[PDB]
């Protein structure tokens with residue numbers, strides 16, 4: 863599924879991401895627009911072999927198992943396809959462990975380069991929240 867902007871905002875707040883580890887909802891909404899364009903089914907292959915899965919592009923080198931990233935970890939304890947669902951629970955669940963792992967949202971390259979230090983509040987503009 864491709865989320866609407868306020869639709870995704872609503873469902874992320876529902877799932878506890880607004881101000882999770884200090885980061886406002888705007889940050890997360892901005893992270894998703896640049897990582898996946900709000901597409902839950904988004905996939906991207908990396909040079910090292912790993913693949914980035916879903917609306918928040920979680921990488922199989924570190925967080926999920928895709929059965930073809932040999933010698934990698936599965937720290938969220940899920941199969942990577944779990945992250946491609948229309949329901950974002952799994953991705954948001956795993957996202958909370960990523961952002962707590964020491965580097966904050968810097969783990970998300972598009973956030974560091976396109977959302978960080980910008981008016982991220984503007985991504986939740988007009989949303990009935």
Ligand SMILES: CC(=O)N[C@@H]1[C@@H](O)[C@H](O[C@@H]2O[C@H](CO)[C@@H](O[C@@H]3O[C@H](CO)[C@@H](O)[C@H](O)[C@H]3NC(C)=O)[C@H](O)[C@H]2NC(C)=O)[C@@H](CO)O[C@H]1O
Nearest residue numbers: 914918919920921922923924925937960963964965969970
């Ligand atoms: C959303 C996503 O999948 N992002 C990926 C990033 O997770 C990843 O950056 C690397 O992440 C790992 C795992 O968190 C980092 O290891 C951690 O590093 C911190 C210190 O920075 C350390 O305290 C933690 O103990 C350690 N984690 C574990 C489990 O030991 C690693 O440092 C990050 N490396 C870099 C260069 O940023 C990148 C790169 O794999 O990929 C994104 O897709």
